[PDB]
Amino acid sequence: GSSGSSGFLTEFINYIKKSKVVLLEDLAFQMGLRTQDAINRIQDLLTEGTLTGVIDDRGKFIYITPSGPSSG
């Protein structure tokens, strides 16, 4: 359990799970943050494994989460 002003990370991840299709360009717009900033966070989380996804030649983010059983 992370301590301090930790919340944007937890809320950001939860949003991705629910969100079927999330774009990096749109992500920064909705969150206000910059595209590069948003991408950096996604790449970091995906690198550690915290999140699993793939990027296409269109620099788009595609998350594939199992609908229904939220256990693992």
PDB file of N, CA and C in Angstrom:
ATOM      1  N   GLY A   1       0.806  -1.207   0.000  1.00  0.00           N
ATOM      2  CA  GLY A   1       0.000   0.000   0.000  1.00  0.00           C
ATOM      3  C   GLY A   1       0.842   1.260   0.000  1.00  0.00           C
ATOM      4  N   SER A   2       0.928   1.913  -1.155  1.00  0.00           N
ATOM      5  CA  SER A   2       1.712   3.135  -1.286  1.00  0.00           C
ATOM      6  C   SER A   2       1.189   4.220  -0.349  1.00  0.00           C
ATOM      7  N   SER A   3       2.093   5.073   0.121  1.00  0.00           N
ATOM      8  CA  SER A   3       1.725   6.153   1.029  1.00  0.00           C
ATOM      9  C   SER A   3       2.014   7.513   0.401  1.00  0.00           C
ATOM     10  N   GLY A   4       1.557   8.572   1.061  1.00  0.00           N
ATOM     11  CA  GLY A   4       1.775   9.915   0.554  1.00  0.00           C
ATOM     12  C   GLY A   4       0.636  10.396  -0.322  1.00  0.00           C
ATOM     13  N   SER A   5       0.946  11.292  -1.253  1.00  0.00           N
ATOM     14  CA  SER A   5      -0.063  11.838  -2.155  1.00  0.00           C
ATOM     15  C   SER A   5      -0.278  10.914  -3.350  1.00  0.00           C
ATOM     16  N   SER A   6      -0.488   9.632  -3.069  1.00  0.00           N
ATOM     17  CA  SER A   6      -0.703   8.644  -4.120  1.00  0.00           C
ATOM     18  C   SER A   6      -2.193   8.428  -4.364  1.00  0.00           C
ATOM     19  N   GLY A   7      -2.655   8.813  -5.550  1.00  0.00           N
ATOM     20  CA  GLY A   7      -4.057   8.654  -5.889  1.00  0.00           C
ATOM     21  C   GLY A   7      -4.298   8.675  -7.385  1.00  0.00           C
ATOM     22  N   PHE A   8      -3.625   9.586  -8.078  1.00  0.00           N
ATOM     23  CA  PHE A   8      -3.773   9.710  -9.524  1.00  0.00           C
ATOM     24  C   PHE A   8      -3.380   8.412 -10.223  1.00  0.00           C
ATOM     25  N   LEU A   9      -2.393   7.720  -9.665  1.00  0.00           N
ATOM     26  CA  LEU A   9      -1.921   6.463 -10.235  1.00  0.00           C
ATOM     27  C   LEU A   9      -2.974   5.369 -10.084  1.00  0.00           C
ATOM     28  N   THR A  10      -3.534   5.255  -8.884  1.00  0.00           N
ATOM     29  CA  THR A  10      -4.554   4.251  -8.608  1.00  0.00           C
ATOM     30  C   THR A  10      -5.822   4.520  -9.410  1.00  0.00           C
ATOM     31  N   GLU A  11      -6.260   5.776  -9.411  1.00  0.00           N
ATOM     32  CA  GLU A  11      -7.462   6.164 -10.139  1.00  0.00           C
ATOM     33  C   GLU A  11      -7.247   6.048 -11.646  1.00  0.00           C
ATOM     34  N   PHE A  12      -6.036   6.366 -12.091  1.00  0.00           N
ATOM     35  CA  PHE A  12      -5.700   6.300 -13.508  1.00  0.00           C
ATOM     36  C   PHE A  12      -5.770   4.864 -14.017  1.00  0.00           C
ATOM     37  N   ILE A  13      -5.287   3.930 -13.204  1.00  0.00           N
ATOM     38  CA  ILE A  13      -5.295   2.520 -13.571  1.00  0.00           C
ATOM     39  C   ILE A  13      -6.717   1.971 -13.616  1.00  0.00           C
ATOM     40  N   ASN A  14      -7.507   2.306 -12.601  1.00  0.00           N
ATOM     41  CA  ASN A  14      -8.890   1.848 -12.525  1.00  0.00           C
ATOM     42  C   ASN A  14      -9.686   2.322 -13.737  1.00  0.00           C
ATOM     43  N   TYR A  15      -9.371   3.520 -14.213  1.00  0.00           N
ATOM     44  CA  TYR A  15     -10.058   4.090 -15.367  1.00  0.00           C
ATOM     45  C   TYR A  15      -9.763   3.285 -16.629  1.00  0.00           C
ATOM     46  N   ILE A  16      -8.524   2.820 -16.749  1.00  0.00           N
ATOM     47  CA  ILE A  16      -8.113   2.036 -17.907  1.00  0.00           C
ATOM     48  C   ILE A  16      -8.847   0.699 -17.954  1.00  0.00           C
ATOM     49  N   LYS A  17      -8.931   0.036 -16.806  1.00  0.00           N
ATOM     50  CA  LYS A  17      -9.609  -1.252 -16.713  1.00  0.00           C
ATOM     51  C   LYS A  17     -11.040  -1.151 -17.230  1.00  0.00           C
ATOM     52  N   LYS A  18     -11.772  -0.155 -16.742  1.00  0.00           N
ATOM     53  CA  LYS A  18     -13.155   0.053 -17.156  1.00  0.00           C
ATOM     54  C   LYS A  18     -13.224   0.524 -18.606  1.00  0.00           C
ATOM     55  N   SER A  19     -12.325   1.434 -18.971  1.00  0.00           N
ATOM     56  CA  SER A  19     -12.286   1.966 -20.328  1.00  0.00           C
ATOM     57  C   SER A  19     -11.807   0.906 -21.315  1.00  0.00           C
ATOM     58  N   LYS A  20     -12.683   0.529 -22.240  1.00  0.00           N
ATOM     59  CA  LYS A  20     -12.351  -0.475 -23.243  1.00  0.00           C
ATOM     60  C   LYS A  20     -11.217   0.007 -24.143  1.00  0.00           C
ATOM     61  N   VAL A  21     -11.405   1.175 -24.748  1.00  0.00           N
ATOM     62  CA  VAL A  21     -10.396   1.749 -25.631  1.00  0.00           C
ATOM     63  C   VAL A  21      -9.952   3.121 -25.139  1.00  0.00           C
ATOM     64  N   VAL A  22      -8.670   3.238 -24.806  1.00  0.00           N
ATOM     65  CA  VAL A  22      -8.118   4.498 -24.322  1.00  0.00           C
ATOM     66  C   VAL A  22      -6.985   4.983 -25.220  1.00  0.00           C
ATOM     67  N   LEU A  23      -7.100   6.218 -25.693  1.00  0.00           N
ATOM     68  CA  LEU A  23      -6.085   6.801 -26.564  1.00  0.00           C
ATOM     69  C   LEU A  23      -5.134   7.691 -25.770  1.00  0.00           C
ATOM     70  N   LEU A  24      -3.862   7.678 -26.154  1.00  0.00           N
ATOM     71  CA  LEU A  24      -2.852   8.486 -25.480  1.00  0.00           C
ATOM     72  C   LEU A  24      -3.122   9.974 -25.678  1.00  0.00           C
ATOM     73  N   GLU A  25      -3.498  10.345 -26.898  1.00  0.00           N
ATOM     74  CA  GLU A  25      -3.788  11.738 -27.216  1.00  0.00           C
ATOM     75  C   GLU A  25      -5.006  12.231 -26.441  1.00  0.00           C
ATOM     76  N   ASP A  26      -6.037  11.395 -26.376  1.00  0.00           N
ATOM     77  CA  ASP A  26      -7.261  11.746 -25.664  1.00  0.00           C
ATOM     78  C   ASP A  26      -7.047  11.692 -24.155  1.00  0.00           C
ATOM     79  N   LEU A  27      -6.220  10.751 -23.713  1.00  0.00           N
ATOM     80  CA  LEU A  27      -5.930  10.592 -22.292  1.00  0.00           C
ATOM     81  C   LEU A  27      -5.383  11.886 -21.700  1.00  0.00           C
ATOM     82  N   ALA A  28      -4.424  12.490 -22.396  1.00  0.00           N
ATOM     83  CA  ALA A  28      -3.820  13.736 -21.942  1.00  0.00           C
ATOM     84  C   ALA A  28      -4.839  14.869 -21.933  1.00  0.00           C
ATOM     85  N   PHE A  29      -5.744  14.852 -22.907  1.00  0.00           N
ATOM     86  CA  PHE A  29      -6.772  15.881 -23.013  1.00  0.00           C
ATOM     87  C   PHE A  29      -7.753  15.792 -21.847  1.00  0.00           C
ATOM     88  N   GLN A  30      -8.257  14.587 -21.596  1.00  0.00           N
ATOM     89  CA  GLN A  30      -9.206  14.368 -20.511  1.00  0.00           C
ATOM     90  C   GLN A  30      -8.555  14.634 -19.157  1.00  0.00           C
ATOM     91  N   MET A  31      -7.326  14.158 -18.994  1.00  0.00           N
ATOM     92  CA  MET A  31      -6.594  14.345 -17.747  1.00  0.00           C
ATOM     93  C   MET A  31      -5.850  15.676 -17.747  1.00  0.00           C
ATOM     94  N   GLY A  32      -5.881  16.366 -18.883  1.00  0.00           N
ATOM     95  CA  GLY A  32      -5.207  17.646 -18.993  1.00  0.00           C
ATOM     96  C   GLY A  32      -3.717  17.497 -19.237  1.00  0.00           C
ATOM     97  N   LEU A  33      -3.103  16.531 -18.564  1.00  0.00           N
ATOM     98  CA  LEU A  33      -1.672  16.287 -18.710  1.00  0.00           C
ATOM     99  C   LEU A  33      -1.268  16.279 -20.180  1.00  0.00           C
ATOM    100  N   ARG A  34       0.037  16.243 -20.430  1.00  0.00           N
ATOM    101  CA  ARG A  34       0.554  16.231 -21.793  1.00  0.00           C
ATOM    102  C   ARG A  34       0.621  14.806 -22.336  1.00  0.00           C
ATOM    103  N   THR A  35       0.586  14.682 -23.659  1.00  0.00           N
ATOM    104  CA  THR A  35       0.641  13.376 -24.305  1.00  0.00           C
ATOM    105  C   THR A  35       1.881  12.601 -23.873  1.00  0.00           C
ATOM    106  N   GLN A  36       3.035  13.258 -23.933  1.00  0.00           N
ATOM    107  CA  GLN A  36       4.292  12.629 -23.548  1.00  0.00           C
ATOM    108  C   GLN A  36       4.251  12.176 -22.092  1.00  0.00           C
ATOM    109  N   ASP A  37       3.723  13.033 -21.226  1.00  0.00           N
ATOM    110  CA  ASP A  37       3.623  12.721 -19.804  1.00  0.00           C
ATOM    111  C   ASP A  37       2.741  11.498 -19.578  1.00  0.00           C
ATOM    112  N   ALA A  38       1.577  11.488 -20.219  1.00  0.00           N
ATOM    113  CA  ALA A  38       0.642  10.377 -20.087  1.00  0.00           C
ATOM    114  C   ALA A  38       1.260   9.077 -20.592  1.00  0.00           C
ATOM    115  N   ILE A  39       1.904   9.145 -21.752  1.00  0.00           N
ATOM    116  CA  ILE A  39       2.539   7.972 -22.342  1.00  0.00           C
ATOM    117  C   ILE A  39       3.627   7.418 -21.428  1.00  0.00           C
ATOM    118  N   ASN A  40       4.433   8.314 -20.867  1.00  0.00           N
ATOM    119  CA  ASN A  40       5.514   7.915 -19.972  1.00  0.00           C
ATOM    120  C   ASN A  40       4.978   7.091 -18.806  1.00  0.00           C
ATOM    121  N   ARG A  41       3.836   7.509 -18.269  1.00  0.00           N
ATOM    122  CA  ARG A  41       3.217   6.809 -17.148  1.00  0.00           C
ATOM    123  C   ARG A  41       2.720   5.431 -17.575  1.00  0.00           C
ATOM    124  N   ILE A  42       2.127   5.364 -18.762  1.00  0.00           N
ATOM    125  CA  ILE A  42       1.608   4.106 -19.286  1.00  0.00           C
ATOM    126  C   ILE A  42       2.738   3.125 -19.578  1.00  0.00           C
ATOM    127  N   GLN A  43       3.794   3.619 -20.216  1.00  0.00           N
ATOM    128  CA  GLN A  43       4.941   2.784 -20.554  1.00  0.00           C
ATOM    129  C   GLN A  43       5.608   2.241 -19.295  1.00  0.00           C
ATOM    130  N   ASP A  44       5.699   3.082 -18.271  1.00  0.00           N
ATOM    131  CA  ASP A  44       6.315   2.685 -17.009  1.00  0.00           C
ATOM    132  C   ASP A  44       5.495   1.598 -16.323  1.00  0.00           C
ATOM    133  N   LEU A  45       4.182   1.796 -16.274  1.00  0.00           N
ATOM    134  CA  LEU A  45       3.286   0.833 -15.644  1.00  0.00           C
ATOM    135  C   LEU A  45       3.266  -0.481 -16.419  1.00  0.00           C
ATOM    136  N   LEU A  46       3.313  -0.381 -17.743  1.00  0.00           N
ATOM    137  CA  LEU A  46       3.303  -1.561 -18.600  1.00  0.00           C
ATOM    138  C   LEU A  46       4.624  -2.317 -18.501  1.00  0.00           C
ATOM    139  N   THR A  47       5.704  -1.581 -18.258  1.00  0.00           N
ATOM    140  CA  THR A  47       7.027  -2.181 -18.139  1.00  0.00           C
ATOM    141  C   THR A  47       7.131  -3.040 -16.882  1.00  0.00           C
ATOM    142  N   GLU A  48       6.580  -2.537 -15.782  1.00  0.00           N
ATOM    143  CA  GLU A  48       6.612  -3.258 -14.515  1.00  0.00           C
ATOM    144  C   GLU A  48       5.619  -4.417 -14.524  1.00  0.00           C
ATOM    145  N   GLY A  49       4.704  -4.397 -15.489  1.00  0.00           N
ATOM    146  CA  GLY A  49       3.710  -5.449 -15.590  1.00  0.00           C
ATOM    147  C   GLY A  49       2.362  -5.031 -15.037  1.00  0.00           C
ATOM    148  N   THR A  50       2.368  -4.019 -14.174  1.00  0.00           N
ATOM    149  CA  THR A  50       1.137  -3.524 -13.569  1.00  0.00           C
ATOM    150  C   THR A  50       0.005  -3.471 -14.589  1.00  0.00           C
ATOM    151  N   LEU A  51       0.363  -3.272 -15.852  1.00  0.00           N
ATOM    152  CA  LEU A  51      -0.624  -3.203 -16.925  1.00  0.00           C
ATOM    153  C   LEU A  51      -0.124  -3.923 -18.172  1.00  0.00           C
ATOM    154  N   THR A  52      -1.051  -4.517 -18.919  1.00  0.00           N
ATOM    155  CA  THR A  52      -0.705  -5.238 -20.136  1.00  0.00           C
ATOM    156  C   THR A  52      -1.432  -4.659 -21.344  1.00  0.00           C
ATOM    157  N   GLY A  53      -0.666  -4.245 -22.349  1.00  0.00           N
ATOM    158  CA  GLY A  53      -1.255  -3.677 -23.547  1.00  0.00           C
ATOM    159  C   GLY A  53      -0.283  -3.638 -24.709  1.00  0.00           C
ATOM    160  N   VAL A  54      -0.778  -3.253 -25.881  1.00  0.00           N
ATOM    161  CA  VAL A  54       0.055  -3.174 -27.074  1.00  0.00           C
ATOM    162  C   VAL A  54      -0.136  -1.842 -27.791  1.00  0.00           C
ATOM    163  N   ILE A  55       0.906  -1.393 -28.482  1.00  0.00           N
ATOM    164  CA  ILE A  55       0.853  -0.134 -29.213  1.00  0.00           C
ATOM    165  C   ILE A  55       1.027  -0.359 -30.710  1.00  0.00           C
ATOM    166  N   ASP A  56       0.185   0.293 -31.504  1.00  0.00           N
ATOM    167  CA  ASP A  56       0.248   0.166 -32.956  1.00  0.00           C
ATOM    168  C   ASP A  56       1.033   1.321 -33.569  1.00  0.00           C
ATOM    169  N   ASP A  57       1.215   1.274 -34.884  1.00  0.00           N
ATOM    170  CA  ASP A  57       1.948   2.316 -35.592  1.00  0.00           C
ATOM    171  C   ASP A  57       1.270   3.672 -35.419  1.00  0.00           C
ATOM    172  N   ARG A  58       0.059   3.657 -34.872  1.00  0.00           N
ATOM    173  CA  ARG A  58      -0.696   4.883 -34.655  1.00  0.00           C
ATOM    174  C   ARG A  58      -0.542   5.369 -33.216  1.00  0.00           C
ATOM    175  N   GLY A  59       0.525   4.926 -32.559  1.00  0.00           N
ATOM    176  CA  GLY A  59       0.768   5.325 -31.185  1.00  0.00           C
ATOM    177  C   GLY A  59      -0.489   5.288 -30.338  1.00  0.00           C
ATOM    178  N   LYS A  60      -1.310   4.265 -30.548  1.00  0.00           N
ATOM    179  CA  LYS A  60      -2.551   4.115 -29.798  1.00  0.00           C
ATOM    180  C   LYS A  60      -2.400   3.070 -28.698  1.00  0.00           C
ATOM    181  N   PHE A  61      -3.179   3.223 -27.631  1.00  0.00           N
ATOM    182  CA  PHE A  61      -3.132   2.292 -26.510  1.00  0.00           C
ATOM    183  C   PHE A  61      -4.360   1.387 -26.502  1.00  0.00           C
ATOM    184  N   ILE A  62      -4.124   0.079 -26.512  1.00  0.00           N
ATOM    185  CA  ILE A  62      -5.209  -0.893 -26.506  1.00  0.00           C
ATOM    186  C   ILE A  62      -5.090  -1.843 -25.320  1.00  0.00           C
ATOM    187  N   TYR A  63      -6.066  -1.785 -24.421  1.00  0.00           N
ATOM    188  CA  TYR A  63      -6.071  -2.641 -23.241  1.00  0.00           C
ATOM    189  C   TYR A  63      -7.031  -3.812 -23.419  1.00  0.00           C
ATOM    190  N   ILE A  64      -6.552  -5.014 -23.117  1.00  0.00           N
ATOM    191  CA  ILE A  64      -7.369  -6.215 -23.243  1.00  0.00           C
ATOM    192  C   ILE A  64      -7.614  -6.857 -21.882  1.00  0.00           C
ATOM    193  N   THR A  65      -8.686  -6.432 -21.218  1.00  0.00           N
ATOM    194  CA  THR A  65      -9.033  -6.965 -19.907  1.00  0.00           C
ATOM    195  C   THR A  65     -10.221  -7.918 -19.998  1.00  0.00           C
ATOM    196  N   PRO A  66     -10.168  -9.007 -19.218  1.00  0.00           N
ATOM    197  CA  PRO A  66     -11.232 -10.015 -19.193  1.00  0.00           C
ATOM    198  C   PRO A  66     -12.509  -9.493 -18.544  1.00  0.00           C
ATOM    199  N   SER A  67     -13.586  -9.446 -19.322  1.00  0.00           N
ATOM    200  CA  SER A  67     -14.869  -8.963 -18.824  1.00  0.00           C
ATOM    201  C   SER A  67     -15.573 -10.040 -18.005  1.00  0.00           C
ATOM    202  N   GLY A  68     -15.971  -9.685 -16.787  1.00  0.00           N
ATOM    203  CA  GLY A  68     -16.651 -10.632 -15.922  1.00  0.00           C
ATOM    204  C   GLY A  68     -15.848 -10.963 -14.680  1.00  0.00           C
ATOM    205  N   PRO A  69     -15.083 -12.063 -14.741  1.00  0.00           N
ATOM    206  CA  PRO A  69     -14.252 -12.513 -13.621  1.00  0.00           C
ATOM    207  C   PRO A  69     -13.069 -11.584 -13.368  1.00  0.00           C
ATOM    208  N   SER A  70     -13.197 -10.735 -12.352  1.00  0.00           N
ATOM    209  CA  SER A  70     -12.138  -9.791 -12.008  1.00  0.00           C
ATOM    210  C   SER A  70     -11.212 -10.378 -10.947  1.00  0.00           C
ATOM    211  N   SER A  71     -10.845 -11.644 -11.125  1.00  0.00           N
ATOM    212  CA  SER A  71      -9.965 -12.324 -10.182  1.00  0.00           C
ATOM    213  C   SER A  71      -8.674 -12.764 -10.864  1.00  0.00           C
ATOM    214  N   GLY A  72      -7.584 -12.777 -10.102  1.00  0.00           N
ATOM    215  CA  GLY A  72      -6.301 -13.178 -10.648  1.00  0.00           C
ATOM    216  C   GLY A  72      -5.160 -12.954  -9.676  1.00  0.00           C
TER     217      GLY A  72
END
